[model samples]
Target: QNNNEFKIGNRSVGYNHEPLIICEIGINHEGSLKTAFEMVDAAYNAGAEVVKHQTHIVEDEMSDEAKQVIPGNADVSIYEIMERCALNEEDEIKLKEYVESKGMIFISTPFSRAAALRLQRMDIPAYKIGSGECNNYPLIKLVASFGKPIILSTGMNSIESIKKSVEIIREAGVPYALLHCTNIYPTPYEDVRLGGMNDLSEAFPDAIIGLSDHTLDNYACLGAVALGGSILERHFTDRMDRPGPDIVCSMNPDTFKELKQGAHALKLARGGKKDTIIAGEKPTKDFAFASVVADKDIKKGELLSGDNLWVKRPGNGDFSVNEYETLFGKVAACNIRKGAQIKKTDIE
Candidate 1:
């Protein structure tokens, strides 16, 4: 229902382009700029086009109450965890420069007004909104004001509930994409709910569709590409052996490389109308399709019948297999040799 395309940095995104692979380093750097730099290098070598970071300004994004609550995947309080992992402004600026130096797009998810303002100052090419903030209309309004492309993740949200947020982005008229997601950490494959992408595509036909996957393997993201996803995001790390709660769902360099290659292959495979035969396949069809052939020699003017006619390969005959039945009850106009392909003139 939409035009089905948009731009992120200089690359085209949508149905017309290959899926954008984002290596979401989101706090998996574990507060070390050194680790973040290493991940940037690894992801780049793994063929990632974009590297995403998380910008969390603790005081502005969370409260003291967060200190009492722990996430399902971590042992520490959520507030304490953010405090431990959140990168300071100076480090983030340096990281962004380093990522850009490697010729990759640097985008980040800003969890608060202060964090969003920081990204604005950093002048990122686009903004990636986490699933937790999908319905935060206030934040959505603030970010949309910046007038850059926004990739919004929808998890823990229904199509109906997400409508308001979608409308806000649409009204702003800035380019945006909606990423179907499951909020569970290391989401079970069964719980990935790939069909939810269909629901999102149907409800918000004007928005570009993508997948923010948290599964342990690349299978989900590849499946998403087959479903017309233009953006494929996964948590990424240099080594799965390294300690981090997110490492369970994150792809290492080897797996991430395969993910990039497989996504592109699937995107190419997903092209074209199902019922249409493409021009490139015609040569193969000529050799592969069946056609009516003279099974043995026959006298001129003899009747064509199953005894002397059958279907065969190398379909260069004028009479195709589809016309085999019509060939019966007809007379041969010329003498036909054994194993000869039958033409229309030969039969009638």
Candidate 2:
């Protein structure tokens, strides 16, 4: 969205706003449009602001040679699964329409030129570059040419490749956000270099930073927000037992919900502009005060020592404990009751 300030739609995507939550449906639907729709519904119910899918032109993404050479789990080809999950224009339109109806931004990753062209026509809100395609300069250039905001995944990439890709995107006039990631499915905690997002921001100094989590749970995603990232992309599946490729690594609806709320909570807890203050902090700062009262009755002209002036609540006399030192050794101007709070007026 390009305006001098904020534009494109109702939301303005910048550091000023809450972190944008992107629910990546991806190919977890496994070629079932009905399942895709259901997944989108779950994403909406779980408080996703955007729903993203992967648009794979499998033929272009995987060559016949690579498809033949690379082995998939259970002897199934990666190309075969991608081809099955690739959405036709009809499927694309259904997803976009469904997402729009739910009042969410619709986004997708185009794995090839053909898929990119199809997405262009579909008017997808933004472009996302998956980790597998991070170093694919051709696809990067193609998506960057769209001039839409881009969310980039940096997994299986070296610092140099990431810098090059980021430079290409920004030069193409596409505003981009970085998602630090590990290409490993169900990424282990140790493999996740979330610190990279911060380092990427410091190194680039121009890009928005975020996390693309392959984590099996919400822990890493929540932690990333505190470390500083403007966007969070997570994979979602209907059921872990659903037998899909991503189901093994993706978050279920309940976990996705927790990630959404928990990330925002962490962001809020980080707070803003630290400063010291006194008096009247509304809503949550109200506090009860105590006072220093005479533990025993003190007669006129009697010296009130620490033993005589003890701290107690509901003073019922003359002094507040916060100023205890100021009243030390002062003589009582009149007879003071045992429960009386000592004050300057009662001192000689």
Candidate 3:
């Protein structure tokens, strides 16, 4: 939006700021605090500004029916999977501390009201709402009550359906961002829909815009940066070789490092008037631009015709390519050699 970009801890996110890069650890730690710590360290070393986790209290978040259903990405039932992967409250708090200790913001998505309350108690700097919950006004209302920043993913939702949830966040008066996303795991490249960012920016002009990528590689991630995404979130892991459903779309440390570099480069390349020459291009312009020059030797007072005059390189001549037509049929005031730059003074 037009307001100064909001902050996550000390870092600003919005137009004109560096894109906020988040390595979503989620349950990739697989319930091991040790692994979570390692991932946090790797994300920090890889130059991520934040790491996201998922806070799920199964009893409060899911019904027993979940035990019978398996997700497409994994063979395990959702219940058994989360039970295996969810970190306990104490461990989650410890992980958050470790993440903040590394000078990175630690944010988590709360799957239920109880989970949201738990994070609120932890004094989390912000809450990240997953795409699945974008229309969950109840949970959104609960998290909004905490009065911290919110980053909401808009996957499995339409702009119309998101209005109520966004209204709730806006009324709460907390800084917020909307992340364009596709719910499909390892999302097809065709469906990544970088254009949705434009839709979000148009629909919620007061909210910051970003992308929560589900693609298997960094191409979509880089494309998001080019599309004016001010915040980027992708599932991340220290080891892709290890088994995890999210790993199919997750970035390892090396890939994450490259994503950060590419994003910075893209951000720097943005803005400024396109028709105007940038100051950095001046040096190249001096040597690369064409200039009027003598094509062959010409005696003094020789007519400056196409046979003897043409445009050449090293554009330090007083007469540039712009003056080429004007010089036609004009007499050369001084003798000129082939391959020599022509000055305005040489023409009569």
Best by TM-score: 1
Model 1: per-residue Cα lDDT at residue 119: 98
lDDT of 2 by residue, 1-348 (tens): 111222224655545557777788898888889999988888777777788888877777778865565333335677777777777778888988998899888889888888888888887767888888899898899888876778788888887888889888878986677778877676788988677876777777767777888767878888887876668888877667776766766777788778778877877775455575634654333223567788899989999888788876654335666777667788999898897667667787
lDDT of each: 0.90, 0.76, 0.89
The TM-scores of all predictions, comma-separated, are: 0.90, 0.79, 0.86
lDDT head-to-head 2 vs 3, winner: 3
Q: List the residue pairs that clash in candidate 2.
A: 318-341, 319-341
Error of 2 at 267 (Å): 5.0
lDDT of 1 by residue, 7-106 (tens): 8789899977878988999999999999999999998887788999999899999888989999989998999989989999999999999999999999
Per-residue CA lDDT of model 3 for 258-294, tens digit only, reads 9999999998886556698678999999998899988
Of the two candidates 2 and 3, the one with more favorable TM-score, higher being better, is: 3
Which residue runs does candidate 3 get wrong by more than 4 Å? 1-4, 293-309, 328-348
Model 2, stretches more than 4 Å misplaced? Answer: 1-9, 41-48, 68-77, 88-94, 101-103, 158-161, 193-197, 200-206, 225-229, 263-268, 273-287, 295-299, 302-304, 314-319
